[PDB]
Nucleic acid binder design. Structure first.
Ligand SMILES: [Mg+2]
Ligand SMILES: [Mg+2]
Ligand SMILES: [Mg+2]
Ligand SMILES: [Mg+2]
Ligand SMILES: [Mg+2]
Ligand SMILES: [Mg+2]
Ligand SMILES: [Mg+2]
Ligand SMILES: [Mg+2]
Ligand SMILES: [Mg+2]
Ligand SMILES: [Mg+2]
Ligand SMILES: [Mg+2]
Ligand SMILES: [Mg+2]
Ligand SMILES: [Mg+2]
Ligand SMILES: [Mg+2]
Ligand SMILES: [Mg+2]
Ligand SMILES: [Mg+2]
Ligand SMILES: [Mg+2]
Ligand SMILES: [Mg+2]
Ligand SMILES: [Mg+2]
Ligand SMILES: [Mg+2]
Ligand SMILES: [Mg+2]
Ligand SMILES: [Mg+2]
Ligand SMILES: [Mg+2]
Ligand SMILES: [Mg+2]
Ligand SMILES: [Mg+2]
Ligand SMILES: [Mg+2]
Ligand SMILES: [Mg+2]
Ligand SMILES: [Mg+2]
Ligand SMILES: [Mg+2]
Ligand SMILES: [Mg+2]
Ligand SMILES: [Mg+2]
Ligand SMILES: [Mg+2]
Ligand SMILES: [Mg+2]
Ligand SMILES: [Mg+2]
Ligand SMILES: [Mg+2]
Ligand SMILES: [Mg+2]
Ligand SMILES: [Mg+2]
Ligand SMILES: [Mg+2]
Ligand SMILES: [Mg+2]
Ligand SMILES: [Mg+2]
Ligand SMILES: [Mg+2]
Ligand SMILES: [Mg+2]
Ligand SMILES: [Mg+2]
Ligand SMILES: [Mg+2]
Ligand SMILES: [Mg+2]
Ligand SMILES: [Mg+2]
Ligand SMILES: [Mg+2]
Ligand SMILES: [Mg+2]
Ligand SMILES: [Mg+2]
Ligand SMILES: [Mg+2]
Ligand SMILES: [Mg+2]
Ligand SMILES: [Mg+2]
Ligand SMILES: [Mg+2]
Ligand SMILES: [Mg+2]
Lengths: 60, 209, 206
RNA sequence: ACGCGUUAAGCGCGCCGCCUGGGGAGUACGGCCGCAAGGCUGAAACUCAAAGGAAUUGACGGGGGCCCGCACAAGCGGUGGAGCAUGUGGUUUAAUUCGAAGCAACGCGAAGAACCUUACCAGGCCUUGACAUGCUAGGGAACCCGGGUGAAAGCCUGGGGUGCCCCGCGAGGGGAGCCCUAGCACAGGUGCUGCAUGGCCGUCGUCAGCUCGUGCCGUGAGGUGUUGGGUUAAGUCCCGCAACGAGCGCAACCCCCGCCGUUAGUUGCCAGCGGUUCGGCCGGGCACUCUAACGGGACUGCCCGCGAAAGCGGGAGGAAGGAGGGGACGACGUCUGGUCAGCAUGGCCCUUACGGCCUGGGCGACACACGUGCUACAAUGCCCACUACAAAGCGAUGCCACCCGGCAACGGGGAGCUAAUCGCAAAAAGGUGGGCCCAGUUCGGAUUGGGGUCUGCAACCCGACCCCAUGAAGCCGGAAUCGCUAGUAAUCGCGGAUCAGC
RNA sequence: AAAAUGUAAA
RNA sequence: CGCGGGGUGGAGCAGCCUGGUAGCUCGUCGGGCUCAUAACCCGAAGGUCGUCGGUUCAAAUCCGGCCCCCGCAACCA
C-alpha cells in the first residue's frame, strides 16, 4: 500500500469521481491540501525549511 | 455454563470451573491441561515493566458417576447379643445389642442404645450407611484431587502467550505463531489442530513400533 | 519533544526563502513539485561537493538555480565540464529552462547544514561520537563563530539503548529572533540504525 | 562522619569489664536462684550477601514559613436526565482493518468511508509483477479498431501498419525503440518490533527553573555560587555574601488590535459645485472613510509619599502608565509517553504470496456502558410579513446577479467578473407590525409513511436537501461534574480548509 | 480527629 | 417412629396468631469518587413463600398428607 497504492491515484481511473487526491511527496491519502498537492505533514516540513515561498508562520 | 467461580478483585476469576457441554469437546480441549505462561505489561503495573505470570488449567472429561444402591443384606453380617450395663433382668435375657459387619469394606458398627433389638439395628444400619458413604466420599476425593496432582506438576509445559512480541508459542510441539490476537479471541484451532496431528503421528509409531 | 524549527521561526526576519518566486493558485503546486524535484536530485548528485543551500527562482519559463558550496571544484568539473552536463540533465527533466551560477560560501565551518553532514559522515565511519561533537564545536568556535552547539540522537556507537548527546561553546539564543543563527539536519545511516545530527551555529546579532 | 575537646571522645600509664557479620537468640539444653512471673550463666544446626554507623543528594509528608493558579471561594451558563449528532468500550459479525488508554485515549490520526478512499471480509482473478534500474531467448515495430467471455478484473483474438540508424541496386538482411512472449538479477509488504531508532508531537510547563568554568570548603559523595533582606509575572532587579563570572531559560527583538503622521488615490471613498436615465449615478475631486507601506508614540519621563538601593504605593497629562489587550516563542530534563499506519530507518518475517487487480460486502453492526456534542423543555418565548447594522475569507474545470417554470429542493435561459470592479451574500440576533395565551401548547422536531430535486457509472446496505402527513421522549434533570474574571462568559449569525457529493 | 490498601521483570 | 419448633429473593431473618398487603440487613447489577481498589454516595434488579392437596370471592397466612431440618423424650424390670 506504499509504492503500489499511490500508483492508482496517479493514473486516471475508470470513473469520474473514483479519482482521488494524495500527497505529491509522502503519498498520504487522508488530509491533502490541494493548493500544493501536499499533506498537512509534508506541508509543515517544507514550509519550515523555507522551500515553500512566501509562506511564513502566521501570528495575530 | 460456569460452576464454581471465585472472583479476583480486578480482573479475574482467581479460580473458575465450567461445564462445557456438547460433542467432541473433550477431544479438542484435551491438551489444555497444564501451565500457561503470560508475558506482558500487566494492568496493575505501577510503572512500565513487563511482567511474567502463569495459570494452570485442567480439562477433565465428563465422568459417569453412580453411588451403590444403598446396602445389601447378602454382604451384611449381623450379630445379636446381650447388651452391656444396666437393665435389670431384661438386660440379662435379651440379645438386644446389635453388630453389623459390612463385609466388602470391613467397617463394623455395634449399637446397644435402646431396649429393642430392632431399633438398635435401625440405628446401626443408619450409621453403617453413613460410614460407607463418607468412605466413598473420601475415596472420590483421593481420586479427584490426586488426578489433579497427576496432571499438574513440577513441569514448565504448555503454551506461552507473549503480548509485546504478540506471539503465542505452544512449547510441547514447538509450534509458534505470532498471531496471538486471534488466539486470544477464540480461534484456537490453528494451535490445537497442529497438536492433535502431532499426537496422531505418535500413535502411528506406538504399537506398530 | 517541543523545540521549534529555528528556520521556519525566522522567515523574512533573519532568513530568506530557499525558493523565491510568485505563482497564483492554478499552478503553484506543480511549480513547487518540479522545484522540489530539482533540489532533491541536486542534493543526490551534488552531495560530493557538499552543498550548504540550494536557491531557486523562476520567471516566464525562465528558471534560475543558484547552488552553494565551499568546495566547487566538483561542480565545475574538468576544465568546466561537469557543470554543463549537469544543466544538460536539468532541462532534460524540467522541460522548461536551465541555470548555473554556483557561488561559494567562504568558511564551510560557519555553515551548519554543511557541518552536520561532515559530522554525520564521521559517525557512519565509526568515530568517537563524544569527541567528534567537541571537535565540531571547536572548529566552529575557533573559526569566528559567536556560538555553537551540536546534538546527535540514536544508538550512539551501536548502543542497544539509544540516547541524546551534545556539547556547546559560546552562546546559542534560539529564543532570540534578532540573532542570526544557522541550522541544518544530517541523517547518519548505519548498521545499527539511523542517528541524526542537528547543528546550531550562532553567527551574531543584527 | 556526626561531633568530643581540662566535666575529652586529646596525649600517656595502671587495672577490671566486654566485643568478633545479620537472622536463629538472650532462645534451647545444663547448672544456679525465685512463691511465681522470671532472673543469671548461655550455645548449635539451619539460613541470608548482607545486617549495620554517620554523612549526601533528592523525593515524599494527613511537617513548617513566604508566595502563586479560574484550585477554593463570589459568580453566570452548562454536562450528568431527554431526543438526536458523533467518538469509544463492549458485544455481534464471513469481516465489522490498524493505532490512541487517567490528567496528557474517547468530534483523537480522519481538513470528507456510497465505489474509489482501504490497510478488512467473501469470491473471481494476476505472477520479473501497478512501480525502479538492469541482463536478454522468440528476436516481433507505432498506434488506433473490434470481437469473444465476463460482475468487473482477467483471459483470448481478428486487425493492420506497408514507422527510423545500413553508398540497401536487389526476393533478404543489418541497430536504436513505447513496445510484445520467456528468463535471471530484483521489485513489493499499511507484515512484526515506538521496549532496537531518526524526525516530529503531547506533557509536567510559559512553571521559573537548570547548569558549566574557575576559586574556596569537604577524607568523600557533595557544598559554595543558585543562599540571604527587599522586590517582581519571573534565578526580575537591588543590596549583601568565599565566591567571581558565564551559558540555556525569563524579558526584549516579530506579528495583529488601540492613537497619530508622511506617502498612495482605483476597482475604494464623497465633504462643497455642476449634473439631474428618481441616484457616487454622470462630470468632478483626495478632504474624510477605507486600503497597505513606511513611521511617530510611553521612558516610573514629571508630580506625591515610603525606600540604602531596586522599586512599591497614589496623582497628573495622555488614544494608551508600570507586561495596554492578544498572538508567535515551550530551558536542563521528566513521563521505558506517542507515532515502524505520513515519511525515513537497524533487525525479523512473507515471496505465484503477508505482493498486485477487480466486483461486491464491511469500516455506518446493536441486549447495553462512557466521553464530547447539537436541538430542546418555552411568554426575557415561538411563528409570520416589512425594515435594517457586520467582519474575515472563497471564487475563469468556479462564483452565479438577472429574468423564466416550480408550493419548494431546483431546472431551463442568461449578464458579469481570472475580481477593493462581478458574484457567493438574505448577516442572524435587532427594530416595527400582526397572531399565539400557559395546554405535551402555534412549545419541542425525534420517528415514520408517501412523493420528488441534486451529485455521481451507481445512493439497497449507506448520502445531503425539498413538499405533504406522522408530531415521540422531554414541564429544567440523582449521586456527581465542567467552562470562563472584560468586550470575557452567555447568546446571535457568517466564512473557510477537506471536498463530485455529504 | 477526617480517611485503609498498591503483588511479582530493567 | 412419641411431643415441639422450622422451610420466604444467592446468605441470614420478619411477615402467618388476625386471609386481601411479600419486609429488614448483607450480597449482586448499573452510575459516581479515587491514579486505581475498598470504604462511601446515587439508582436498580432479584422470590410466585418445601411439597402435594382441601377451605375460601381470594391463601405466604387457614385446614389435612408427605419430604427435609432442629430441639425434647425414650423410664420400672
Ligand atoms: Mg493488500
Ligand atoms: Mg489523474
Ligand atoms: Mg472522491
Ligand atoms: Mg480462591
Ligand atoms: Mg476453593
Ligand atoms: Mg451373635
Ligand atoms: Mg476387605
Ligand atoms: Mg473482534
Ligand atoms: Mg540553509
Ligand atoms: Mg563543647
Ligand atoms: Mg559529664
Ligand atoms: Mg552469627
Ligand atoms: Mg551472636
Ligand atoms: Mg535469660
Ligand atoms: Mg534453663
Ligand atoms: Mg517454675
Ligand atoms: Mg506471665
Ligand atoms: Mg521476662
Ligand atoms: Mg515567587
Ligand atoms: Mg465555584
Ligand atoms: Mg437524523
Ligand atoms: Mg472468523
Ligand atoms: Mg466488450
Ligand atoms: Mg493482426
Ligand atoms: Mg511567565
Ligand atoms: Mg561533612
Ligand atoms: Mg581529615
Ligand atoms: Mg546546585
Ligand atoms: Mg536567614
Ligand atoms: Mg538568572
Ligand atoms: Mg484588521
Ligand atoms: Mg450636500
Ligand atoms: Mg438643471
Ligand atoms: Mg514605531
Ligand atoms: Mg497612573
Ligand atoms: Mg506595579
Ligand atoms: Mg528513564
Ligand atoms: Mg438536532
Ligand atoms: Mg419566478
Ligand atoms: Mg412562484
Ligand atoms: Mg443551465
Ligand atoms: Mg475584464
Ligand atoms: Mg425583533
Ligand atoms: Mg424527518
Ligand atoms: Mg415547568
Ligand atoms: Mg490488604
Ligand atoms: Mg500499583
Ligand atoms: Mg434464607
Ligand atoms: Mg475508590
Ligand atoms: Mg432483569
Ligand atoms: Mg430470577
Ligand atoms: Mg394450596
Ligand atoms: Mg389454594
Ligand atoms: Mg387427618
Amino acid at each position: 500500500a506504499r509504492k503500489a497504492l499511490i500508483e492508482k491515484a496517479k493514473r486516471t481511473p475508470k470513473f469520474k469521481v473514483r479519482a482521488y487526491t494524495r500527497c505529491v511527496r509522502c503519498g498520504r491519502a487522508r488530509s491533502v491540501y490541494r493548493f500544493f498537492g501536499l499533506c498537512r505533514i509534508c506541508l509543515r516540513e517544507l514550509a519550515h525549511k523555507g522551500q515553500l515561498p512566501g509562506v511564513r508562520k502566521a501570528s495575530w | 455454563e460456569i460452576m464454581s467461580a471465585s472472583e479476583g478483585e480486578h480482573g479475574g476469576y482467581k479460580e473458575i470451573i465450567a461445564k462445557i457441554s456438547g460433542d467432541g469437546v473433550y477431544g479438542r480441549l484435551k491438551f489444555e491441561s497444564g501451565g500457561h505462561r503470560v508475558q506482558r505489561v500487566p494492568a496493575t503495573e505501577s510503572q512500565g515493566r513487563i511482567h511474567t505470570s502463569a495459570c494452570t488449567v485442567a480439562v477433565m472429561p465428563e465422568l459417569p458417576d453412580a453411588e451403590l444402591p444403598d446396602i445389601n443384606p447378602a454382604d451384611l453380617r449381623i450379630d445379636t447379643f446381650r447388651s452391656s450395663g444396666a437393665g435389670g433382668q431384661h438386660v440379662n435375657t435379651t440379645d438386644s445389642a446389635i453388630r453389623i459387619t459390612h463385609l466388602p469394606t470391613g467397617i463394623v458398627v455395634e449399637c446397644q442404645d435402646e431396649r429393642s433389638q430392632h431399633k438398635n439395628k435401625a440405628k446401626a444400619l443408619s450409621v453403617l450407611g453413613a460410614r460407607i458413604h463418607a468412605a466413598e466420599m473420601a475415596k472420590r476425593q483421593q481420586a479427584e484431587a490426586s488426578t489433579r496432582r497427576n496432571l499438574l506438576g513440577s513441569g514448565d509445559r504448555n503454551r506461552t502467550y507473549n503480548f509485546p512480541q504478540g506471539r503465542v508459542t505452544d512449547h510441547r510441539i514447538n509450534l509458534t505463531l505470532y498471531r496471538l490476537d486471534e488466539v486470544m479471541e477464540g480461534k484456537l484451532d490453528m494451535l490445537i489442530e497442529p497438536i492433535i496431528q502431532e499426537h496422531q503421528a505418535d500413535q502411528l509409531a506406538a504399537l506398530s513400533e | 519533544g517541543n523545540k521549534i524549527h529555528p528556520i521556519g521561526f525566522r522567515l523574512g526576519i533573519t532568513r530568506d526563502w530557499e525558493s523565491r518566486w510568485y505563482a497564483g493558485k492554478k499552478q503553484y503546486r506543480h511549480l513547487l513539485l518540479e522545484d522540489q524535484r530539482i533540489r532533491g536530485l541536486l542534493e543526490k548528485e551534488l552531495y560530493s561537493a557538499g552543498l550548504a543551500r540550494v536557491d531557486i527562482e523562476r520567471a516566464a519559463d525562465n528558471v534560475a538555480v543558484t547552488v552553494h558550496v565551499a568546495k566547487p571544484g566538483v561542480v565545475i568539473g574538468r576544465g568546466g565540464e561537469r557543470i554543463r552536463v549537469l544543466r544538460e540533465e536539468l532541462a532534460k527533466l524540467t522541460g522548461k529552462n536551465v541555470a548555473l551560477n554556483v557561488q561559494e560560501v567562504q568558511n564551510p565551518n560557519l555553515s551548519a547544514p554543511l557541518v552536520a553532514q561532515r559530522v554525520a559522515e564521521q559517525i557512519e565511519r565509526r568515530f568517537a561520537v563524544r569527541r567528534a561533537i567537541k571537535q565540531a564545536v571547536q572548529r566552529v568556535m575557533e573559526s569566528g563563530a559567536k556560538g555553537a552547539k551540536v546534538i546527535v540522537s540514536g544508538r550512539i556507537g551501536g548502543a542497544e539503548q539509544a540516547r541524546t548527546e551534545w556539547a556547546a561553546q559560546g552562546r546559542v539564543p534560539l529564543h532570540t529572533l534578532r540573532a542570526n543563527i544557522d541550522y541544518g539536519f544530517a541523517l547518519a545511516r548505519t548498521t545499527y540504525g539511523v542517528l541524526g545530527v542537528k547543528a546550531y551555529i550562532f553567527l551574531g546579532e543584527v
